[PDB]
Design a protein around this ligand. Sequence first.
Ligand code: 33A
Length: 344
Amino acid sequence: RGQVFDVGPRYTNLSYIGEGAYGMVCSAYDNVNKVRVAIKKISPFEHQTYCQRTLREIKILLRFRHENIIGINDIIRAPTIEQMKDVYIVQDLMETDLYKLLKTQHLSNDHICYFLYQILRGLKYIHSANVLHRDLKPSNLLLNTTCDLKICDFGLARVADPDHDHTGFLTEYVATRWYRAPEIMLNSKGYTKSIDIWSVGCILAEMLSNRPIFPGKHYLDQLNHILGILGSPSQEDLNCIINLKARNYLLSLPHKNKVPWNRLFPNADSKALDLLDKMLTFNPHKRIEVEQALAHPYLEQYYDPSDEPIAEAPFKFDMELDDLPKEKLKELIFEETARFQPGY
Ligand SMILES: O=C(NCc1ccccc1)c1cc(-c2n[nH]cc2-c2cccc(Cl)c2)c[nH]1
């Protein structure tokens, strides 16, 4: 529908689901497994940025194997790099994403607790492979008819690099704004696992009220919203911010008191709010880690370290495809998708 969707013989009966930039997603029938599946068309070979997000995601999703992470069952493309204009990614078909649910459905504490658990169970695996998602948000969280959750879209995911994390004040950033951590606008490049935890916390706050917690309308407004609820950062939290332009801005701000979680979330579970507090901690070094998040009393009826697997092996270092030209990426996208062609 709309435009060309050439998913070959093995997939039939196309139904539009949704799209976006350099992509488009339909549902089809897998004749080999007799089950309906989701397929996403990708046309990234235009400029490097698309190719870059497409290579990462294919490279990661293909090495990752986890119940709460979306997998790639199949990849359809042309037999030659010279004929390849599009690439099709076959993935599990899910009923919906968390973004849609929050629009019309009120979640029970049980649903909130289970959804939270699956997010962290999957995030733990991701960080085990030394990888950051870096764009966690409701729309990147898929649910099926029995409320099984799968994290998707690793287009902004990078290998963790905490040693080269520092940067100047008000540094431009690409991930979704409502879920950007405080330090992003202050002095962080986003190469620390503490980036993801913050977003999860934003997500946990949004699940409690069906509203985004920090809905900034622009870059610096995002920091205002956060400071408006957590209140002024303490002296010790302020001493960790060594960058002067960053520290002075915070200093130039009038003293603001923190708003009690139970003031914002009246009918929320106390154990939930306590964990929310740990996740939405201003100081990234103090912010609770994922494996602590699971061991938290709130997730007590699900927590089981033996049933929450980690990666067999991480990614050695940051993927160097950062300054790699359009041509080499297409070649790499081509080489990464080879295992799915019949002549292989
Ligand atoms: O990768 C995915 N989404 C992220 C994304 C990035 C760029 C462009 C489009 C989608 C994705 C979603 C799904 C999916 N499975 N079942 C339902 C979906 C789905 C739900 C809501 C919206 C879409 Cl567009 C797709 C499979 N892959």
